[PDB]
Amino acid sequence: XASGQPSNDKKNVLPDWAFGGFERPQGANPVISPIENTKFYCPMTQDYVAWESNDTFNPAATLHDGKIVVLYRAEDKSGVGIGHRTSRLGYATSSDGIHFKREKTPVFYPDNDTQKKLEWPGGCEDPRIAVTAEGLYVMTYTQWNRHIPRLAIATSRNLKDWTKHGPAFAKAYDGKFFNLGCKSGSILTEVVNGKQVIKKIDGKYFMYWGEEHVFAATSEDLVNWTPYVNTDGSLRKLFSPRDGHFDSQLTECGPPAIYTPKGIVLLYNGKNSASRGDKRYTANVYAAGQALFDANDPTRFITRLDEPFFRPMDSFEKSGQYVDGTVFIEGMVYYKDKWYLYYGCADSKVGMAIYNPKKPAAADPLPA
Ligand SMILES: OC[C@H]1O[C@@H](O)[C@@H](O)[C@@H](O)[C@@H]1O
Ligand SMILES: OC[C@H]1O[C@H](O)[C@@H](O)[C@@H](O)[C@@H]1O
Numbered sequence: 001x002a003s004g005q006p007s008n009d010k011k012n013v014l015p016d017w018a019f020g021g022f023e024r025p026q027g028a029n030p031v032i033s034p035i036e037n038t039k040f041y042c043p044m045t046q047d048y049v050a051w052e053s054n055d056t057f058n059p060a061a062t063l064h065d066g067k068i069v070v071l072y073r074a075e076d077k078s079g080v081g082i083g084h085r086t087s088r089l090g091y092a093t094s095s096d097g098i099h100f101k102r103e104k105t106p107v108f109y110p111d112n113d114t115q116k117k118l119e120w121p122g123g124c125e126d127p128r129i130a131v132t133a134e135g136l137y138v139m140t141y142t143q144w145n146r147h148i149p150r151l152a153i154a155t156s157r158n159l160k161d162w163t164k165h166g167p168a169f170a171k172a173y174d175g176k177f178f179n180l181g182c183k184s185g186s187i188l189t190e191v192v193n194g195k196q197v198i199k200k201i202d203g204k205y206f207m208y209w210g211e212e213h214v215f216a217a218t219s220e221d222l223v224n225w226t227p228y229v230n231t232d233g234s235l236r237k238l239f240s241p242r243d244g245h246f247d248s249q250l251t252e253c254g255p256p257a258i259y260t261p262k263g264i265v266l267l268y269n270g271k272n273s274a275s276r277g278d279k280r281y282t283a284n285v286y287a288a289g290q291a292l293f294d295a296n297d298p299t300r301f302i303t304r305l306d307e308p309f310f311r312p313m314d315s316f317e318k319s320g321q322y323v324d325g326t327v328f329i330e331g332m333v334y335y336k337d338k339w340y341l342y343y344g345c346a347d348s349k350v351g352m353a354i355y356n357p358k359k360p361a362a363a364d365p366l367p368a
Contacts, residue, residue: 090103
């Protein structure tokens with residue numbers, strides 16, 4: 001029989017620099033689920049497809065015209081396995097971050113355009129959105145053609161009319177990384193006069209990126225990015241998965257990075273290795289971490305959380321299309337003086353949670 005002693009409890013204490021806890025609002029989640037009946041005339045297919053009928057997940061989030069806007073990854077029924085459908089982005093708006101008005105057709109999708117060899121048939125996956133102080137939204141996303149996933153950039157002033165600029169790493173180093181399999185780009189931002197905007201460091205834009213390791217890149221124009229490289233020209237690893245912890249197979253960038261008085265915070269997704277990971281957590285689960293970098297030297301790693309701050313807790317987080325579970329963190333909005341987090345739930349649903357700095361919740365508990 002348990003005795004309920006405090007010193008044996010499952011608290012998960014955060015360092016002072018870390019965001020959280022993020023509390024799921026009672027009864028709210030999932031906030032975006034598939035809809036069977038909504039059809040789209042696909043300009044590639046030349047017929048109507050049920051574009052959000054399978055799974056709706058891995059979302060971007062931003063602020064526009066006084067509302068939270070989410071662009072959600074939506075998959076059709078054009079194939080069975082993971083990565084075998086076509087991904088297109090849905091559009092939804094909310095004044096409370098919980099109840100959304102969705103558009104019935106997608107806003108971003110593969111088309112008869114400059115990117116068709118890179119985006120057909122897999123489409124456009126896993127967006128992250130940040131905005132300049134001058135009002136240009138910058139989207140990082142994955143192009144998927146069933147051969148190589150590529151990290152790419154699109155821009156817009158209104159979140160509807162998007163210009164595709166192609167792979168982020170197309171141009172640098174005489175095209176060395178054009179064919180690099182890559183994804184998950186977190187541009188550096190800062191809250192200025194209450195609004196989260198893209199932030200320059202040393203006169204250039206900055207992005208953390210990657211799935212298997214955390215890498216970095218700079219840009220002068222927000223579309224052509226130059227990775228940081230080692231002496232021999234290989235990609236320079238800022239940090240990597242580690243034995244014994246939740247972030248043991250992958251350390252995959254999450255939402256845009258945030259410049260704070262303690263340093264730059266990168267919120268990211270860890271995948272737990274069955275062989276090398278933390279056996280207190282489910283093998284192969286994705287659970288979220290945070291890393292701190294030097295404010296004056298953005299590639300200089302300081303520390304990371306030892307335990308995830310947010311992990312699968314509800315049924316639709318614990319299992320779904322991705323059977324081993326995810327809380328795949330990807331969007332954040334500073335809104336009404338709180339932080340609204342948007343995440344994929346097991347590659348199937350969209351969830352949200354709120355960190356209120358004035359009334360902070362606990363982090364998700366240890367299993368342990
Ligand atoms: O990018 C191609 C595919 O890569 C897989 O590992 C998953 O991330 C899929 O959701 C994606 O469709
Ligand atoms: O399938 C789990 C997970 O795989 C990748 O590592 C991610 O980039 C996401 O696309 C997806 O949510």
